Amino acid sequence: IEIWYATSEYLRQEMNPNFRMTDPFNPVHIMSFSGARGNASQVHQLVGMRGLMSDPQGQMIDLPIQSNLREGLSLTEYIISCYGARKGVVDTAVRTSDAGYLTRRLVEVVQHIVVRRTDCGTARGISVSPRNGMMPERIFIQTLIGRVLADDIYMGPRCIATRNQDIGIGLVNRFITFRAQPISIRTPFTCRSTSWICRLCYGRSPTHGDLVELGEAVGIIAGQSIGEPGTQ
């Protein structure tokens, strides 16, 4: 199992260098590098080696596949390959069904939530620190974009941001340069009711890039958003 995995993996690693150095304009490279179609794994199978396969019950089969589709798989190899294919077909059918149940149920819990008021009046906010979790800067940025601040942030005697101000990528970056660690943000968990939300707590809309308007169905959008990525 080990000798064969290493051989397959080295070959995959070396495919891109070969194309970029020796044949830059080959059709297979253009299609993959561009982003148009193909994935490195898919190409590896056409031009390298298909590799070790997993039998039902998760056990490797012990006969390596040393061939690619151009060269042509042997009868024995083809049969082993079929194993994987039944797994895919069974998974696709199942995944389509499971997703729908999760979505129906998620919409039901949160269907009633609409934005009904401008300010709840809360003076509480969650605090986000770069530390307190080991957070890659990416995570820190993504949490913060789109939220309204619940307290002023100051560097020395100057105010970087004031309460009731939205945070965008430029502000987030200033906070990173100046290392302002405790930032307090209004968040759905900080609002004063459970039958509705306020504009300031929810924050900027994903669609139009401005504060959410009164009358929007935040709940139906949340259910759908968690669920649709489910097919993948």
Binding site: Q111, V114, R116, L214, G215, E216, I220
Partner: protein, 41 residues
Amino acid sequence: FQETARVLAKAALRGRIDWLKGLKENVVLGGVIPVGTGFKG
């Protein structure tokens, strides 16, 4: 949405009153949903 008989019985006994404040409920009644253009402001 799930246990229809059981809910309906408990309610009939208690005389439950529903103020129609959500989306699905107003759909059954065929009336304007209180969201978007429907939310009145």
